[PDB]
Amino acid sequence: PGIVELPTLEDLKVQEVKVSSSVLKAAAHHYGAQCDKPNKEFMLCRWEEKDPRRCLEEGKLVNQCALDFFRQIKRHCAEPFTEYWTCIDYSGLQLFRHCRKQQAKFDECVLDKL
Amino acid sequence: MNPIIYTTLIMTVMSGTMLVMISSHWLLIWIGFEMNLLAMIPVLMKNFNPRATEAATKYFLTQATASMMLMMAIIINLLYSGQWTITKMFNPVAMTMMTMALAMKLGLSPFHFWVPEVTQGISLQAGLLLLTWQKLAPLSVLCQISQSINPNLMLTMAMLSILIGGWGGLNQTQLRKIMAYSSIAHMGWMTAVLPYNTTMTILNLLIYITMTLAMFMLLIHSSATTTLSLSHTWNKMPVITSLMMVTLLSMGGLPPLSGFMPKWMIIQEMTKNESIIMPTLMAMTALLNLYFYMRLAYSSSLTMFPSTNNMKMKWQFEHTKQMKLLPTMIVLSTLVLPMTPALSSLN
Amino acid sequence: MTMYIAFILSTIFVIGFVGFSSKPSPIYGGLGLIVSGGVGCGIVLNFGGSFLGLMVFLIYLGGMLVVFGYTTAMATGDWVIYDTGDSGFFSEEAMGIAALYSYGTWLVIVTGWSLLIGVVVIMEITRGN
Amino acid sequence: MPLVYMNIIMAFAIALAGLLMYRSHLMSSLLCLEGMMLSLFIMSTLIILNTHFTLANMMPIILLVFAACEAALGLSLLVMVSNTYGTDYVQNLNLLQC
Amino acid sequence: MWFEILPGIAVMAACLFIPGMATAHIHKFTNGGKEKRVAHFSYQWNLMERDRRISGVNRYHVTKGLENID
Amino acid sequence: MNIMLTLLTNVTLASLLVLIAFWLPQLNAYSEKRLPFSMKFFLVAITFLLFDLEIALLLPLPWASQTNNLKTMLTMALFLLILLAASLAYEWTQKGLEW
Amino acid sequence: PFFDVQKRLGLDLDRWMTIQSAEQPHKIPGRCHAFEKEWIECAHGIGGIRAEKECKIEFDDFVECLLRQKTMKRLSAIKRQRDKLIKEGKYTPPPHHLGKEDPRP
Amino acid sequence: MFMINILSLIIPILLAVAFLTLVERKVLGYMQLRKGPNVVGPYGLLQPIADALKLFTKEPLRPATSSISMFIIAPILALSLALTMWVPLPMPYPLINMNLGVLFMLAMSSLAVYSILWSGWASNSKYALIGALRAVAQTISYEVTLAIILLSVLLMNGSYTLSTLITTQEHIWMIFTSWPLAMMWFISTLAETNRAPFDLTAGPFAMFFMAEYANIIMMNAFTAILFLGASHDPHTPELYTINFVLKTLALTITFLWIRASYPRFRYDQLMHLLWKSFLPLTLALCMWHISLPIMTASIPPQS
Amino acid sequence: LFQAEKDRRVLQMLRENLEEEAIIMKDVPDWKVGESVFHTTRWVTPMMGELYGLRTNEEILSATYGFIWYT
Amino acid sequence: AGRIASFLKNAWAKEPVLVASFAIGGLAIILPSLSPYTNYAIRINRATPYNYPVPLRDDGNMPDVPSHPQDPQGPSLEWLKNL
Ligand SMILES: CCCCCCCCCCCCCCCCC[C@@H](O)O[C@H](CO[C@H](O)CCCCCCCCCCCCCCC)COP(=O)(O)OCC[N+](C)(C)C
Ligand SMILES: CCCCCCCCCCCCCCCCC[C@@H](O)O[C@H](CO[C@H](O)CCCCCCCCCCCCCCC)COP(=O)(O)OCC[N+](C)(C)C
Ligand SMILES: CCCCCCCC/C=C\CCCCCCCC(=O)O[C@H](COC(=O)CCCCCCC/C=C/CCCCCCCC)COP(=O)(O)OCCN
Structure with missing residues (x-):
């Protein structure tokens, strides 16, 4: 009863965000504050179309938006940010309350830079 | 037992049947069956003795097995189509399982063996309740899924029930066994018409409940549980025996009594569906039920049996307690044939 | 694949049922039923039903078969049908079971009534006389 | 329908047949009933978890509880029968007959 | 006197020291010097699986920072 | 896998230690020379079974407290506890807890 | 028989639990939510006879989602053919299916 | 290195239960104006080893008619359950991190009665069977209130995860939030393990003793x-x-203290204790602890 | 971001399976490569056997029981 | 008046556990209907996001729907912070 159309492997090639869950968690709040427009556009598209194949283009824009965000952090406060995510990456449950001192350092480093 | 506890148990039995009748979810129907069984056991053992305990354990075993296969049918139905609503079954295997579970719950042959023994074990009030109220829930469930049933299996059990009741009633001196076999035959008659018309099923159920209530109340009034104990009743209360004879004639399906109304209509309905052999066999078989009803009438009201001297003292006392609605039951179980077209009320 | 561990557990389940269904020496039948209950709890747990498997293992084994043993002593193709997504930051079985107090009010009412009636009924049945 | 459902259904059928055999020892009858209930619980849980039907996670617990109550009732009955005969043999229950 | 009960208690205490301490050190050794990751609720498990896939060595605890962003 | 291995190790150790206990003194030569059925015990077992079923109903309470329907959950949870209390009171007043 | 008390009083005693696609807690969907939704909206207000006749496509899809019989048959056929080709020797699995692939986040 | 962790959990526990006999004897002796063992070993320290060797070199008296199967099974189940119940506990990090760890421990404790039932059944004696029935009845009776008290306490924790109990008590102990429940829990744990004042009842004997300790x-x-x-x-x-x-040792020494301080109950007296004093208060305080977080808007996080 | 990665990964695994099926089913007479079993054209979430059917037993075991067995 | 006080005093003696049990259960039933923090508990439960907030498609007719999380439109949790 029909043939299931799948995008070719070339249409699924994108520059991946290759950072661990601790690094992603340490930047989650600012990443949500910054990359909100492409992320919401992708999710609105993802819930309305209800089909992975129909949103392949919008999902490539969220990868870029995230790469750009991490590039800005790298080029401005890699020092302070690396001390923050290394403290969050130590906790088994990766709690935010076990490194408020480090978070403050990285919170002042992005408000006085970006 | 305590009257408050007995009232609570009877109300719980009623609530189990009503929960079966008003729910649309298979789990809640099964829960109603469970609650009904749970509260029915003490009622059968209200008068404690070994016979009542044996009857209660037999009844519990049969009803628990039926409930397990009921649950099994529900799960199988759920696996094939994920639905909990009580409608026609989506699986053929599930339907047969459902059909046999309700056959055990009603007492249809070949699952009839428990009815005579349980009825013999319990008292007359427990027997009245068991043979009248305990048929509403399984029959209502059967009515709700009648479009799903395989006619072959269902009609096979109906005809078997009629034959078995007719044959087994011929061998009985005990009145409770006679009532149990009569109930088996009437269940067969009711279930023979589910595939075609559930209104006829309900009409037969109501007529049968009326006649069974009248018969059990008359047996309680003249506190007799055997043929010979009832043969003494003319020497104290002959009006009771006359009413009992008319009720027995009605229960045998003799026109123009009330008991002729169901079979007639049922036969009529089956003839609409080009079924001729089965109704003929059913009527010729119901002649057996009529025969042992007639034997009871001969022993009770049409001849006068030898009495005893101590009966004289019983002539000096009256019944302290009365059954209300007994006159209404007698009248409704003998003289409602002219009101037959009222069945359009979908009773 | 561990040679169909679910199939192995189901086979042990069936074998235990065959064992205690012969009804030899009801204490031995109860022991076979205990082993079968443990195996079925393992099946449910391996499937992902942690709370329901532990309910089997606690209620069934530790209370009900324990009472059965008390009374007796007084006398003389898998892995493929599974899902793809995740559950979120909760366990769906727990949320559905906890919905008993907000969604299943009617079920709570009927179950509580049935349990109270069962207490009363046991009292009345065992009164004796 | 995979083989796990087939095995659970087969276990249920084996338990039902064992209950219907009645070699002796009504306690074995109750044991067979409760084995049937255990198989029912397992298979219903498997179906409900497999189809991700959240609100039906209520159902197995309910079933368990109700069935356990029945066991209690059954046990009571068994006990009372023994008090009349001294043992729970099936063949003692022949006072009432067809 | 009463302090002669202290030796046995001490021995008992030392034994009860061994399990918990051992666990902690083992969780340091198999987890690259960090506490063993806790995975409830299956979003945590997805995080661990993503970490294991992006480590390049099939080990979730090898953390990739900005030096891997290129 | 970890839990299965742990139980296997526990059971294996217990079996090994019991069998060596039962066989170490079996290697050296030596001389090598009713009815009552109390009903109260059955009734306490049955009472435990019923209260255990009601505890099984009570168990999901820690998760039931995050529902946005706090009033209905509190009513139903309280109702179950009250229901449990009635069973205890009825059994108490009917001489069900005596010896 | 069935006395529809809930519909008369608007109670909803047990209708909340009858189907997968009825307002689950935390909006958690059933595995076959869309198929059941389609089947229900096909068969609404039509009657059981016409529902069984005219909505067989949706019901078949719903059952296929529920039990995955045809899907498992297809997968088994593919696996058996691949096994035969490996035994005889005209097929070689790629690095993807031998664990030698490059995983993606 | 998971096997090493399992072994480093099992072995130290067995040494601890071996030397708990020494500590109990020493503590009871000093509460009785005497000493405990002080001859075998520098401070009695070799007494447990001598006890174990003597027990393991003594003739075992098999009943010669009883069910040898259950006779051998009962100590296996007892000790296996005893060693299994240690896995869920977080000290601080648990060997196995279970979501429903508390429920798992409850289920293990519930199984712990099969050993009593089977040992009584396989003694081939009517009097020992009577004693086993009494023990089983007491155990199930008190595990009822253990379960109810436990869920009432956990309502302030937010889940059944034992690690979260460390998070809940970050600032203040739970003893201050509910001391009545803790009191009834302590008495129920006395009655659960058949310890005085609730002690109404070669090799395999030592196995049973190891499981109880x-x-x-x-x-x-x-x-x-x-x-x-x-x-x-x-x-x-x-x-x-x-x-x-340190806290665990203090509580165990408190068990010894209680054994040394009181007479023992009758059977009916401890049954009445439970069913007429603990259960009513347990139900009332369960109601109270259900109502408390909602009234004060202090419901714990996890769902 | 996780949703985008999940979608891309599932699509890639499905395409790899489709290509291998095209290779394997080349001599089956009545086969049609990549044929749906549903009448609808709506997207249907693949099973676990769809994605890990042709892969090695180790990662099948992972994807099936890793979260359940991780304690 | 006098009968109830006499009964309560006679129960506080020789039955203190039952008096305590009934007092605690009665308070558990009564107080939640009178506490002013239960609505706060309900609101705290409503404020815990377990699911993703699916954005709405803008049509030029949603003034109260924020266009960004930092925008003032929408619910706020200052009352939670101050609690
Ligand atoms: C002896 C013959 C039987 C006894 C006759 C009854 C005697 C006592 C009855 C006293 C009053 C009862 C009437 C109930 C009051 C309200 C009824 C209403 O609420 O319910 C209706 C139902 O009312 C009944 O239908 C009418 C009952 C009338 C029974 C008498 C007819 C029996 C056949 C003729 C025999 C002659 C008897 C006449 C002399 C008394 C709506 O039914 P519905 O929920 O929508 O459909 C469910 C049933 N389905 C599933 C079959 C479709
Ligand atoms: C109406 C006529 C009654 C007289 C007839 C009496 C016959 C027996 C009485 C038993 C029937 C009880 C009716 C209660 C039905 C429950 C459902 C209804 O009440 O709504 C619930 C309202 O809950 C109420 O709080 C129920 C309170 C009732 C329980 C307290 C006492 C019950 C005693 C009943 C008898 C039990 C044994 C006897 C004790 C004396 C739902 O709450 P809500 O949150 O909006 O919706 C949830 C769905 N969501 C999640 C999508 C939002
Ligand atoms: C209304 C609130 C509902 C919720 C609270 C209840 C939660 C749990 C409490 C109920 C548990 C069940 C109790 C069962 C009652 C049976 C009592 C009984 O039978 O005992 C009687 C006697 O007990 C009684 O007196 C009956 C109850 C007496 C009243 C108890 C307290 C009533 C209310 C007191 C406080 C009310 C509110 C507090 C007022 C202060 C302000 C807050 C005989 O005792 P025996 O030990 O058998 O024989 C002794 C000789 N061998």
Whole structure:
């Protein structure tokens, strides 16, 4: 009863965000504050179309938006940010309350830079 | 037992049947069956003795097995189509399982063996309740899924029930066994018409409940549980025996009594569906039920049996307690044939 | 694949049922039923039903078969049908079971009534006389 | 329908047949009933978890509880029968007959 | 006197020291010097699986920072 | 896998230690020379079974407290506890807890 | 028989639990939510006879989602053919299916 | 290195239950104006080893007619359950991190009665069977109130995860939030392990004894984690381990103290104690602890 | 971001399976490569056997029981 | 008046556990209907996001729907912070 159309492997090639869950968690709040427009556009598209194949283009824009965000952090406060995510990456449950001192350092480093 | 506890148990039995009748979810129907069984056991053992305990354990075993296969049918139905609503079954295997579970719950042959023994074990009030109220829930469930049933299996059990009741009633001196076999035959008659018309099923159920209530109340009034104990009743209360004879004639399906109304209509309905052999066999078989009803009438009201001297003292006392609605039951179980077209009320 | 561990557990389940269904020496039948209950709890747990498997293992084994043993002593193709997504930051079985107090009010009412009636009924049945 | 459902259904059928055999020892009858209930619980849980039907996670617990109550009732009955005969043999229950 | 009960208690205490301490050190050794990751609720498990896939060595605890962003 | 291995190790150790206990003194030569059925015990077992079923109903309470329907959950949870209390009171007043 | 008390009083005693696609807690969907939704909206207000006749496509899809019989048959056929080709020797699995692939986040 | 962790959990527990006999004898002796063992070993320290060797070199008296199967099975189940109940506990980090760890421990404790039932059944004696029935009835009766008290306490924790109990008691102990529940829990754990004042009842005998003493220690450790919450610093868990071990030792010594201080109940008296004093208060305080977080808007996080 | 990665990964695995099926089913007479079993054209979430059917037993075991067995 | 006080005093003696049990259960039933923090508990439960907030498609007719999380439109949790 029909043939299931799948995008070719070339249409699924994108520059991946290759950072661990601790690094992603340490930047989650600012990443949500910054990359909100492409992320919401992708999710609105993802819930309305209800089909992975129909949103392949919008999902490539969220990868870029995230790469750009991490590039800005790298080029401005890699020092302070690396001390923050290394403290969050130590906790088994990766709690935010076990490194408020480090978070403050990285919170002042992005408000006085970006 | 305590009257408050007995009232609570009877109300719980009623609530189990009503929960079966008003729910649309298979789990809640099964829960109603469970609650009904749970509260029915003490009622059968209200008068404690070994016979009542044996009857209660037999009844519990049969009803628990039926409930397990009921649950099994529900799960199988759920696996094939994920639905909990009580409608026609989506699986053929599930339907047969459902059909046999309700056959055990009603007492249809070949699952009839428990009815005579349980009825013999319990008292007359427990027997009245068991043979009248305990048929509403399984029959209502059967009515709700009648479009799903395989006619072959269902009609096979109906005809078997009629034959078995007719044959087994011929061998009985005990009145409770006679009532149990009569109930088996009437269940067969009711279930023979589910595939075609559930209104006829309900009409037969109501007529049968009326006649069974009248018969059990008359047996309680003249506190007799055997043929010979009832043969003494003319020497104290002959009006009771006359009413009992008319009720027995009605229960045998003799026109123009009330008991002729169901079979007639049922036969009529089956003839609409080009079924001729089965109704003929059913009527010729119901002649057996009529025969042992007639034997009871001969022993009770049409001849006068030898009495005893101590009966004289019983002539000096009256019944302290009365059954209300007994006159209404007698009248409704003998003289409602002219009101037959009222069945359009979908009773 | 561990040679169909679910199939192995189901086979042990069936074998235990065959064992205690012969009804030899009801204490031995109860022991076979205990082993079968443990195996079925393992099946449910391996499937992902942690709370329901532990309910089997606690209620069934530790209370009900324990009472059965008390009374007796007084006398003389898998892995493929599974899902793809995740559950979120909760366990769906727990949320559905906890919905008993907000969604299943009617079920709570009927179950509580049935349990109270069962207490009363046991009292009345065992009164004796 | 995979083989796990087939095995659970087969276990249920084996338990039902064992209950219907009645070699002796009504306690074995109750044991067979409760084995049937255990198989029912397992298979219903498997179906409900497999189809991700959240609100039906209520159902197995309910079933368990109700069935356990029945066991209690059954046990009571068994006990009372023994008090009349001294043992729970099936063949003692022949006072009432067809 | 009463302090002669202290030796046995001490021995008992030392034994009860061994399990918990051992666990902690083992969780340091198999987890690259960090506490063993806790995975409830299956979003945590997805995080661990993503970490294991992006480590390049099939080990979730090898953390990739900005030096891997290129 | 970890839990299965742990139980296997526990059971294996217990079996090994019991069998060596039962066989170490079996290697050296030596001389090598009713009815009552109390009903109260059955009734306490049955009472435990019923209260255990009601505890099984009570168990999901820690998760039931995050529902946005706090009033209905509190009513139903309280109702179950009250229901449990009635069973205890009825059994108490009917001489069900005596010896 | 069935006395529809809930519909008369608007109670909803047990209708909340009858189907997968009825307002689950935390909006958690059933595995076959869309198929059941389609089947229900096909068969609404039509009657059981016409529902069984005219909505067989949706019901078949719903059952296929529920039990995955045809899907498992297809997968088994593919696996058996691949096994035969490996035994005889005209097929070689790629690095993807031998664990030698490059995983993606 | 998971096998090494399992072994480093099992072996030290068995040594601890071996030397708990020494500690109990020493403590009871000094409460009785005497000493305990002080001859075998420098301070009695070799007494447990001598006891174990003597027990393991003595003739075993098989009943010569009883069910040898259940006779051998009962100690296996007892000791296996005793050693299994230690896995869920977080000291600070648990060997197995279970979501429903508390429920798992409840289920293990519930199984613990099959050993009593089977040992009584396989004694081939009517009097020992009577004693076994009494023990089973007492155990199930008190595990009822254990379960109810436990869920009432956990309503302030937010889940059944035992690790979260460390998070709940970060600032204050649970003993201050509910001391009545802790009192009834302590008495119920006395009655659960058949310890005085609730002690109404070669090789395999030592196996049973090891299981009972391991259950005593585990129950006291569970009480310490449940009601006496130590502070845990993720960068030095040894502080938590030492604190938790000290509290567990204190509770075990309190068990010995209680055994040395009181007479024992009758059967009907402890049955009445439970069913007429603990159960009513347990139900009332369960109602109270259900209502409390909602009234004060202090419901714990996890769902 | 996780949703985008999940979608891309599932699509890639499905395409790899489709290509291998095209290779394997080349001599089956009545086969049609990549044929749906549903009448609808709506997207249907693949099973676990769809994605890990042709892969090695180790990662099948992972994807099936890793979260359940991780304690 | 006098009968109830006499009964309560006679129960506080020789039955203190039952008096305590009934007092605690009665308070558990009564107080939640009178506490002013239960609505706060309900609101705290409503404020815990377990699911993703699916954005709405803008049509030029949603003034109260924020266009960004930092925008003032929408619910706020200052009352939670101050609690
Ligand atoms: C002896 C013959 C039987 C006894 C006759 C009854 C005697 C006592 C009855 C006293 C009053 C009862 C009437 C109930 C009051 C309200 C009824 C209403 O609420 O319910 C209706 C139902 O009312 C009944 O239908 C009418 C009952 C009338 C029974 C008498 C007819 C029996 C056949 C003729 C025999 C002659 C008897 C006449 C002399 C008394 C709506 O039914 P519905 O929920 O929508 O459909 C469910 C049933 N389905 C599933 C079959 C479709
Ligand atoms: C109406 C006529 C009654 C007289 C007839 C009496 C016959 C027996 C009485 C038993 C029937 C009880 C009716 C209660 C039905 C429950 C459902 C209804 O009440 O709504 C619930 C309202 O809950 C109420 O709080 C129920 C309170 C009732 C329980 C307290 C006492 C019950 C005693 C009943 C008898 C039990 C044994 C006897 C005790 C004396 C739902 O709450 P809500 O949150 O909006 O919706 C949930 C769905 N969501 C999640 C999508 C939002
Ligand atoms: C209304 C609130 C509902 C919720 C609270 C209830 C939660 C749990 C409490 C109920 C548990 C069940 C109790 C069962 C009652 C049976 C009592 C009984 O039978 O005992 C009687 C006697 O007990 C009684 O007196 C009956 C109850 C007496 C009243 C108890 C307290 C009533 C209310 C007191 C406080 C009310 C509110 C507090 C007022 C202060 C302000 C807050 C005989 O005792 P025996 O030990 O058998 O024989 C002794 C000789 N061998």
